[PDB]
């Protein structure tokens, strides 16, 4: 067995298939970051750091010796525990199709939110700079009126053009901004369609982020490094409940500072 | 023979084909529910209940015995009798093509209305909770002005987005609401087209329901269980008329409470 | 895995084989009901109810609609927990052949007693009418003197003959009555042999029932429906003991009211 200790969990095979399906579905729906960044293959469990290729000056060991430390970025392992009713698990073999997988959905939504907020806003404790912090283009303010959203977005499209950047540009919106441009309409279309006319990429719902992000998806600018992708593991169990977790280990690198514009309220 | 006792009816083969065609046509046109819910294969005549996979605590038979009743949902058999003129039946072999099949059409419309109102509004006596009652998302009020319909509908699309739900969303309208958004026009399109722009599913005419329903058609959320599909059976006959019936047996299950928004006036 | 969670139990393979053998043996010895009634194949875990084929009038949904609920009988799941010493379990691999399987035997005897008392005396909470309650033939009183038992039994054989019934008749006795007709002797035979001369079926020891039952075993009159047959499942464990259970899910149907005579004290 492995670190998931999956065979020790009192979960049947059919219940496991339903839990895997629910977690994978809810996660994909709430991920916006993997649609725009380069996603590496999983390094594996032993992978601990990503080389940046830079060098750090250290106090010379002896006379005439020049020493340099190799710089690297550590992976962070992110774990979201959740708790399942054993009655709901037992219902699945009897043929129930409405078993309560709400904790699985909440854990997948929380893991997806962490991953997206780590990619776009950073996680300083894990030495990850967000796309918002690593952007060299000027930051823009989103207006109160949703009918004035496409104007400011177009100004962001000016800045990537002034930065000398090609590629399909894509706009990612926070859930508040996505709702505002979805529910306001002008001439038989919502403002989301007006945003769709400005770019050759995609208007992407990004419920974890704040504000908005416009960026190129030409490739090679944004890199998500995975040691291991999302997995479900077993912690402990009692007569009534099974404690499990969702787990993934990653770091994020931004190679190109001028490939994005961040917007705030 | 079977319970339809079809060979006992004084109905010719050509008249039977015309009656089957008329009933099937009028039924499909008036069904909205089967276009959005999962429809099972017919279980057969012996099928009487659907297992929910839950358990009900009962008074222990003896000391040290723990007993539980299996929960289930009963099927309901729905029968709509109708009466045909025997002269109209006899006209068909002579080559008439305008035989009065109005009772067949009224029976098919009434059966379709019952089935749709059972799916969406429930039938408490048959222990069926409607989609409106089983929805956990908040209910919305439809405005008087049809030009303000697409706004409220978009708010419903917000709620399924706040519920964490994917899939093609579909809007079902009552006949009053469908007529109102069909006959009012803005900038060369009726408001029905404005509703069509908001979703990737379908604006569906639902003449049996009240208000409106917005819901996902991703699958696995709404399940119509059929023991036997719609069939035409023979009751009795006299010199002038043949009494027949339309009959179907079903139950409806909603597995996912947050997959729909109900709207009312 | 399944709902038994059998691989989670700290029970070795040899100990499992001994427990299965002990439970199966003790159960068969104490079952009288399956020897006389028709026993269906196991429906499976999803099976929840048995269709009776009857209809229940319900308040018409709308005008001109006639509705009927399908009648059914729910299965009941019967669980008898028991507790095993882990030292006795560990003794089996070392080669012990006298490991204390008394709790297994007591659980099998209790499960068998419940099943037989459910078949013959009913379980109202599970909507099961016993053979004694569903019999339309008159009830008889068993006499105090065991030498007068065969007389009354013969009167019961008159009643099935007056009911117009064929087939091998079988007599089932309570443990008190079986002991009384076993230990009293007349002319070199016990009274049990005198009972054996009256029927072409079998004198059957039935320790769970009260009184006596005479009935035909021609087939098709008494039906035991099993969703799942007797199985051993794992609940929980500590350093000293393993909690397990015996479990079976069933209902009982009596189709023929005049196929039996019940006797009481």
Author numbering:
A (entry chain O), B (entry chain Q), C (entry chain SA): 1 to 265
Authors' own words:
In addition, we studied partial encapsulin structures to characterise stable encapsulin shell intermediates in vitro, by using low pH conditions to disassemble encapsulin shells, followed by reassembly at neutral pH. To explore the structural landscape of encapsulin shell formation, we used 2D and 3D (focused) classification and local symmetry to determine the structure of different stable encapsulin intermediates in an incomplete assembly state. This resulted in structures of three distinct intermediates of the encapsulin shell; a 48-mer (3,427 particles, 5.4 Å), a 52-mer (4,378 particles, 4.5 Å) and a 54-mer (6,294 particles, 4.6 Å). All three intermediates have an even number of monomers, appear to be closed on one side of the shell, and miss subunits on the other end. All three stable intermediates have an overall icosahedral structure with RMSD values for the 48,52 and 54-mer compared to the structure of the full shell of 1.08 Å, 0.60 Å and 2.66 Å respectively, although the 54-mer is, compared to the full encapsulin, flattened in one direction and elongated perpendicularly to it. The 52-mer consists of 39 fully resolved, and 13 less well resolved monomers, and the 54-mer consists of 27 fully resolved monomers and 27 less well resolved monomers. Not surprisingly, we observed higher cross-correlation values for Enctb monomers on the far side of the opening and lower cross-correlation values closer to the opening; in particular directly on the edges. On the edges of the intermediate encapsulin shells, we observed many points of three and fivefold symmetry with one or more Enctb subunits missing. However, all dimers (in total 77) have both Enctb subunits present, and where a subunit around five or three fold symmetry is missing, its dimeric partner is also missing. Our intermediate structures indicate that the structure of larger partial shells is largely icosahedral, with some deviations observed in the 54-mer.
